[PDB]
Design a protein around this ligand. Sequence first.
Ligand code: PLM
Length: 470
Amino acid sequence: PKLGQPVEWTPCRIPGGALCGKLAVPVDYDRPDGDVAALALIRFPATGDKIGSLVINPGGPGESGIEAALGVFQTLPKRVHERFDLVGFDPRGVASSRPAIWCNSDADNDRLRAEPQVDYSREGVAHIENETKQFVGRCVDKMGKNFLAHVGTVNVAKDLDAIRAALGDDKLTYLGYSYGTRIGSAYAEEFPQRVRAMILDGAVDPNADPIEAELRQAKGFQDAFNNYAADCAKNAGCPLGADPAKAVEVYHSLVDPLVDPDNPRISRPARTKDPRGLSYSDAIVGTIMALYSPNLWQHLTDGLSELVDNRGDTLLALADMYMRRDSHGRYNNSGDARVAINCVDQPPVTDRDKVIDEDRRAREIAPFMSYGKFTGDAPLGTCAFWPVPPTSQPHAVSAPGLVPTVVVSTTHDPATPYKAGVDLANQLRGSLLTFDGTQHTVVFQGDSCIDEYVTAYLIGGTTPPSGAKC
Ligand SMILES: CCCCCCCCCCCCCCCC(=O)O
């Protein structure tokens, strides 16, 4: 694409008369005459009287907005389809946008997933951190330091305003999920006068401490695990047993044997038709994936029943869904993009004592996710080694002129807990719409109570009353 040139739309190669095109944006907005990024867009034209475009972001970070728009199209309320062009976009560095963040080969990822990743002795910590340093080196080798430095949400928000103008909208109508609510609040702060409407489903509090938010997310997934297990306990054949007070214990009786009990570095994978088998780390990841929605609880139950017989096929497939590894062993770039974006969106945690204390607390908060006992050591995260500095700093959202917005928060959301949505709505001086459930996000996913509130807000600007629940 040509910087400043309008989007050339062409039929995508797909539901509707979907149109696809690219938009050029500067890599560095302070160097407009420099390197350029090409953002991939998809557009489903409105069927009635068009108000404008409804631009979505599915979250992640690292998740394709084009893929999400294709999914949302199938569950879009008729009224929204009539009045809005549904538009998805791949953020800079993500999926079909170019250049795309790449760090790991398919083999790099496969080799890491084969490891139990439970050894937190000094030797185990050293091994993890060495792997992490080699990962970062690969990101730098394949991507520019310059491109890595500018993939953050602060620049995504600027890209979003360019997208708004390229779509012909005077003002933005935006729906953001999870991480996408950070795009939303960043956009709201820099372009408050351009915001027509914003729905933010699954909230990120930009003023949160990174460690406490991580521990609240650990608690969220343990809460979800507990709700899954109490449900399972009522059902015949529950692989975690009929006593939910012992479900964590029984769970570990199923996954812990995937680790050599005398050498925590040795995997004893459960048998699968796939040549990989099921490692302990993939078992945990596959469990986390299933706790995103009750619609995946049946799959977790199938996966744990398989583990009773030392089989791991379903948990492996759940982990592959989390990692976005397709049936040919190919990963999309969501994993690498997620890290690179997260590491520039706030100052990383580099203090060893804080990281060690975090692991001590996480083991108690989310025992389903921890193997063995606290060792007194824990590895630094990937961002502690990141080679370019943060481009955003934690702070409370301040956008006093912003139109009323709607934050949707699910009471037992494991990934973006409920209270984070309460806090974000407070900072935005917006409306809080509550959904009672144990899932991450809910908008345009089959609930007419939620969707009716959202439709009325998008079309007529009507916000839900204080205390609205679905
Ligand atoms: C999304 C896949 C890539 C993960 C980031 C690359 C760093 C690989 C080395 C870390 C090994 C994983 C063990 C530590 C993970 C954690 O701290 O929770």
